[model samples]
Target: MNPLAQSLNEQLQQSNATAFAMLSDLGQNMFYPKGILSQSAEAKSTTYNATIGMATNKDGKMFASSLDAMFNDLTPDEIFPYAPPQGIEELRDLWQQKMLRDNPELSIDNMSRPIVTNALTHGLSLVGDLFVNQDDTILLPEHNWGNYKLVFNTRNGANLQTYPIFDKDGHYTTDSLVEALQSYNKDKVIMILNYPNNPTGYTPTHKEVTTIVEAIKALANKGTKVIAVVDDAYYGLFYEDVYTQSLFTALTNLHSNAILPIRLDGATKEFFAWGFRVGFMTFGTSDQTTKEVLEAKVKGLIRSNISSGPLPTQSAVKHVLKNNKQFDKEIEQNIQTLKERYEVTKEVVYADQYHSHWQAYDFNSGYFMAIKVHDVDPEALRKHLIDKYSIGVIALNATDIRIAFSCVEKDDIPHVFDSIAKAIDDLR
Candidate 1:
């Protein structure tokens, strides 16, 4: 390992022993290379700027005007330049401002500035890089984003314990999560809390968030080190009365030294910019020293892995955010579109005629909603819908199917649900 890594470890060791103890072996060994990237920065102002690999021209075109003219929006310099390993400073600051403005329950002094990842998945992966260890247990809802298994379990070697967040009647409930925390016997635990949840799209109400946070606090107070990882992938899409703020906000204020809240969110789903692949990882702590050390380690991980996320997307996101009056209105308009679809879905899925076919899980926000089918093999149903009905839905398990209302238009929602019910009946 480079001495830079050692230098970071030394700072963590001296400043925060508990945080130091939580790092995985890779994290302890990780360091942002001050070699080339830093050298390039130092040479940025020098007359002879020959520190990095990229070629530059006096005409502002490296070699070809062809590629330079492709995008008229972002300048060729912004498109071509390598972003800093942490991310471009302007985008990071912009996202931080958005976070604070959106989450009134949170304080700027209580959290570190958001560090950009490739997207929310990349943010999840970075958390694994710094915190997860072999056989480290991570708790998740039974209805979860499927990619989480690939990120935490396959990649990081953590044991995932999933507990049901919905009851037998398919009503969303917090009892299982509360019970899981209560019975957990471990020195450290990391649990991912996703509201406006993926498959079911249920954002907890204020009272529900309180229950979850208090249970987390209850477990943390029991001498178990807790990492409350918040994956707000489909954030800012509330369709009903619910806790609209990120759950990270609730955990940040949990007056427990034993709990560390890490939030992974971004513009992917929220901004309707899935292709942009820009996301952020933030630590909920006011300890400036701990913040610095952890950021250095993450920057190191990013340096060693992707080197840096692409620059053009960062610049593009920055552009829209800076001129956000019209952008904000447009985003809200799209969200209203999704909300209308959700309303139509709710009306159709819970209709009396469809009662025998499936039980719809309570959902009010996010892109998707789910159901517990009465007697259909979810995989078979998925195929049947595709082959017979020209429709698509996800087979969550043996008896549950997930439907994305976000993609379907308001007029299409009723037909989609009707077709699903018809398909289930045909299969039965």
Candidate 2:
């Protein structure tokens, strides 16, 4: 290993030996070299007469006129320059503050500063790079986002193990997860807990959350190296009185050596800025790691890939976060709108008239709900709805159809369900 990586490994060993053990060969070797970027940063601060490689006008402004006019509000630097590979320092700090405030369960002692990604999916990919080895087992719910398979399984060559997300009683349960973890005798395990889960917009209740946390603690205590990836993409859209915080909050600081909780979230769904592609990956553990070592490894990974995230988007997000009082109100109002649509959707989909054909899945929070059609292929029903009724929905399998109520208007929700019912009837 290079001296930099050796130093990082020393620090990781000091903080938590298991954390050092957890790094992949790439992760163990990766380091942000103190090369040109470092030299440029130093010169940027100290050099009175600088001749940098970047194209700039004589007045020390970035040489760009068209973009300056297009982004009139921002200065040339903010609009045109690349953000730091990890992200703008201010944005990273601000997002860490936001996570602390929102997830009160997180400890200042155990948490690492948040690292910004191009988006939530990118964050997941970065985690894959750091930890997921070929043929490593990644546990997930049976009904999970298909993109997860693409990110972890297909791309990274990890094996995906799924457990039932809900019990026979139609309530969220952590029993299957516990069972899977107990059965897998591996030292390191990666699992994704995406709540307000995709396809079935369900967030666990307080009791269920407790069960999960306990299960994780139990596994960690027994010397299992657990990597819990909390995917809070559709965060803060909860309608019911469930545990509103990310499961990451509860998982953090649980077992220093045995468990590492990685949080993947973004402004895409949270701030209603999907196009901005702003997301964050945060680390929490019971034991400490050399923060610089871990952070540098992540930055090295980012530098090798996309180089850096967009600057203007980070600036926009920082602005909102700094002026978050009004932004919170806007989010609340949007939540109210989505809640109304969810209620309307439930009323229409669960109406007695539709019981014979299909049954709605339990949904309380998040943007979508799902249904299990009786005696009909969900794909055929989905195509029938689209082709005949001009309505679209996602079919997860032969039996399940996902409906995104987040996009459906309150008044239009009933019609959407009606269309599905009509389509089902036509299929029959």
Q: What TM-score against the true fold does each predicted structure earn?
A: 0.96, 0.95
Candidate 1 residue lDDT tens string, 176-207? 99888889999988889988898899999999
In model 1, which range of ten residues has the least summed lDDT?
59-68
Question: In candidate 2, which residue pairs clash?
Answer: 256-286, 256-287
Candidate 2 shows a clash count of: 2
Candidate 1 displacement at residue 38 in angstroms = 3.9
What are the candidates' C-alpha RMSDs? 1.6, 1.8
Put down candidate 2 lDDT per residue, 1-428, tens digits, no spaces: 88888888888888778777777777888888887777877777664636366666556556557667876456677777678899999999999888888878777777788899998999999889998888888988999999999999899999998999777645667778879767778888898999999989999898899888898888888888888899999888888899987898888846456788899999999999999989998888544455667789999999999999998899889888987898889988998999999989878877899888787778998899988888889888988888899999999986889999898889988888888888888877
Q: After superposition, how far is residue 270 of candidate 1 from its true place, in Å?
A: 1.2
Best-performing candidate as measured by lDDT: 1
lDDT of each: 0.88, 0.85
